[PDB]
Write a protein that binds this ligand. Structure first.
Ligand SMILES: CC(C)(C)OC(=O)N[C@@H](Cc1ccccc1)[C@H](O)CN[C@@H](Cc1ccccc1)C(=O)N[C@@H](CCC(=O)O)C(=O)N[C@@H](Cc1ccccc1)C(N)=O
Lengths: 99, 99
């Protein structure tokens, strides 16, 4: 699809069996999702953004379907206001910026 | 261009004669920059990211050049670790997310 940016680029994602909404963010190196129970062992880590650092639980090799397209990669879980799909996953659906 | 996301989408931006680099951020509503010592009045405001909130100064009608594309828009100046071209300016250059 071609998504114009007049409004926030929110798309449907399916993770851990549930449908959620997530923001396609080209400015995020990583994927950060709101609190949720995920399978497997996690590692504590810290990522930084505009207002500083937050603590996150890192899950590796998690499968996610972004608008029907399957991807598998690291997912960081923590106190984020909203789900952010980052470059680590965007590259897997062949997502590109065009102008 | 059609830009892939294997590395941060950094581009050249010219503003007030000064050349700089900024991140094409589809996850940012606004364009946020380091101090650009811009002339004119501004309005203080708060914006947030991952990690908390920051205080910025809002400057409207700023002539800015992005990849040879000339646009005019609101620039928010403040303590951001990196320059961000948000959707307010990404739309002005006809930028879309595609996959
Ligand atoms: C998620 C990780 C992996 C940590 O990456 C970044 O945060 N990368 C940031 C760039 C950066 C790199 C290095 C250092 C510093 C900054 C992007 O801006 C991330 N894009 C979104 C992520 C996001 C979206 C939604 C909620 C939380 C976080 C963002 O910060 N967007 C801000 C950018 C600033 C701006 O546009 O004004 C935004 O849209 N803020 C809105 C929406 C908002 C409001 C309240 C709270 C949170 C967000 C606002 N009006 O303040």
């Amino acid at each position: 699809p071609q998504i114009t940016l007049w409004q926030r680029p929110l798309v449907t994602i399916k993770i851990g069996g549930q449908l959620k909404e997530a923001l396609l963010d080209t400015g995020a190196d990583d994927t950060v999702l709101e609190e949720m129970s995920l399978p497997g062992r996690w590692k504590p880590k810290m990522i930084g953004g505009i207002g500083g650092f937050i603590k996150v639980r890192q899950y590796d090799q998690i499968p996610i379907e972004i608008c029907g397209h399957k991807v598998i990669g690291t997912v960081l879980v923590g106190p984020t206001p909203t789900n952010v799909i980052g470059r680590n996953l965007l590259t897997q659906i062949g997502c590109t910026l065009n102008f």
